[PDB]
Design an enzyme around this catalytic site. Structure first.
Site, PDB file in Angstrom:
ATOM      1  N   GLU A  35       0.820  -1.205   0.000  1.00  0.00           N
ATOM      2  CA  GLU A  35       0.000   0.000   0.000  1.00  0.00           C
ATOM      3  C   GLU A  35       0.858   1.260   0.000  1.00  0.00           C
ATOM      4  O   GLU A  35       0.552   2.220  -0.716  1.00  0.00           O
ATOM      5  CB  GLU A  35      -0.940   0.004   1.206  1.00  0.00           C
ATOM      6  CG  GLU A  35      -2.038  -1.043   1.147  1.00  0.00           C
ATOM      7  CD  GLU A  35      -3.070  -0.761   0.067  1.00  0.00           C
ATOM      8  OE1 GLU A  35      -3.070   0.356  -0.492  1.00  0.00           O
ATOM      9  OE2 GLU A  35      -3.884  -1.662  -0.219  1.00  0.00           O
ATOM     10  N   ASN A  46      -7.720   9.367  -5.539  1.00  0.00           N
ATOM     11  CA  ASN A  46      -8.516   8.440  -6.324  1.00  0.00           C
ATOM     12  C   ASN A  46      -9.412   9.183  -7.311  1.00  0.00           C
ATOM     13  O   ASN A  46      -9.601  10.398  -7.237  1.00  0.00           O
ATOM     14  CB  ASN A  46      -9.369   7.572  -5.403  1.00  0.00           C
ATOM     15  CG  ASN A  46      -8.546   6.857  -4.358  1.00  0.00           C
ATOM     16  OD1 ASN A  46      -8.822   6.943  -3.161  1.00  0.00           O
ATOM     17  ND2 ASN A  46      -7.520   6.143  -4.808  1.00  0.00           N
ATOM     18  N   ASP A  48     -12.585   9.213  -7.677  1.00  0.00           N
ATOM     19  CA  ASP A  48     -13.811   9.781  -7.133  1.00  0.00           C
ATOM     20  C   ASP A  48     -13.581  11.048  -6.319  1.00  0.00           C
ATOM     21  O   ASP A  48     -14.555  11.642  -5.847  1.00  0.00           O
ATOM     22  CB  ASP A  48     -14.574   8.732  -6.310  1.00  0.00           C
ATOM     23  CG  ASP A  48     -13.797   8.232  -5.097  1.00  0.00           C
ATOM     24  OD1 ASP A  48     -12.675   8.712  -4.844  1.00  0.00           O
ATOM     25  OD2 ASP A  48     -14.328   7.346  -4.394  1.00  0.00           O
ATOM     26  N   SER A  50     -11.790  11.153  -3.512  1.00  0.00           N
ATOM     27  CA  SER A  50     -11.275  10.754  -2.219  1.00  0.00           C
ATOM     28  C   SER A  50      -9.760  10.585  -2.300  1.00  0.00           C
ATOM     29  O   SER A  50      -9.165  10.541  -3.379  1.00  0.00           O
ATOM     30  CB  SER A  50     -11.928   9.450  -1.765  1.00  0.00           C
ATOM     31  OG  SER A  50     -11.470   8.356  -2.538  1.00  0.00           O
ATOM     32  N   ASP A  52      -6.387   8.414  -0.302  1.00  0.00           N
ATOM     33  CA  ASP A  52      -5.896   7.380   0.599  1.00  0.00           C
ATOM     34  C   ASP A  52      -4.694   7.922   1.358  1.00  0.00           C
ATOM     35  O   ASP A  52      -3.836   8.591   0.775  1.00  0.00           O
ATOM     36  CB  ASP A  52      -5.438   6.149  -0.185  1.00  0.00           C
ATOM     37  CG  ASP A  52      -6.560   5.484  -0.947  1.00  0.00           C
ATOM     38  OD1 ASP A  52      -7.722   5.556  -0.494  1.00  0.00           O
ATOM     39  OD2 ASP A  52      -6.273   4.877  -1.999  1.00  0.00           O
ATOM     40  N   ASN A  59      -8.907   5.405   3.373  1.00  0.00           N
ATOM     41  CA  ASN A  59      -9.600   6.259   2.420  1.00  0.00           C
ATOM     42  C   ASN A  59     -10.521   7.255   3.109  1.00  0.00           C
ATOM     43  O   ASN A  59     -11.190   6.929   4.094  1.00  0.00           O
ATOM     44  CB  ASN A  59     -10.416   5.396   1.456  1.00  0.00           C
ATOM     45  CG  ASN A  59     -11.024   6.194   0.333  1.00  0.00           C
ATOM     46  OD1 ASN A  59     -12.202   6.551   0.375  1.00  0.00           O
ATOM     47  ND2 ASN A  59     -10.223   6.484  -0.684  1.00  0.00           N
TER      48      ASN A  59
END
Ligand SMILES: O=C1C(Br)=CC(=C(c2cc(Br)c(O)c(Br)c2)c2ccccc2S(=O)(=O)O)C=C1Br
Ligand code: NA
Length: 128
Positions: A35, A46, A48, A50, A52, A59
């Site tokens: 990750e 991301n 959308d 959002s 991380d 998220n």
């Protein structure tokens, strides 16, 4: 902070992740490796809108507040910046809530695609 492998394992173990909800420590180290490459300051934006955050790429749509994810929740009740700290406590306790979702560690795409089913014990090889 970029953690060492066993340094992160020790911090995750002290924070109780070894066999948390049945997931051995190696699963958590492996997830963090893919990750974030063990970097607490890792972020990814991301599609959308959002973002991380942190060593486990948690998220903002559900778990933390960054002020820029409309319609999102803050279920861990933390600013997303708390997931970038050198101290992994906030990331670990938020991850515990995530893994309790019902889908377990499948919540982490990198775990499902790069750790699940593999020899995750290798990730704690040599650690005390
Ligand atoms: O009665 C207790 C006792 Br005593 C200890 C602990 C914890 C703990 C324990 C150890 Br040992 C440790 O090394 C660290 Br760091 C924290 C803990 C504290 C706060 C948040 C999460 C944990 S959690 O890690 O247990 O989820 C919780 C309860 Br309740
Ligand atoms: Na949020």
């Amino acid at each position: 902070k970029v953690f060492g492998r066993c340094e992160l394992a020790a911090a995750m173990k002290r924070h109780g992740l070894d066999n948390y909800r049945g997931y051995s420590l190696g699963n958590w180290v492996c997830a963090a490796k893919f990750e974030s490459n063990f970097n607490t300051q890792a972020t990814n934006r991301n599609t959308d809108g959002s973002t991380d955050y942190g060593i486990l790429q948690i998220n903002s749509r559900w778990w933390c507040n960054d002020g820029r994810t409309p319609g999102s929740r803050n279920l861990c009740n933390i600013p997303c910046s708390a997931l970038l700290s050198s101290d992994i406590t906030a990331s670990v306790n938020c991850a515990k809530k995530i893994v309790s979702d019902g889908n377990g560690m499948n919540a982490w795409v990198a775990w499902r695609n790069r750790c699940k089913g593999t020899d995750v014990q290798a990730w704690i090889r040599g650690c005390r």
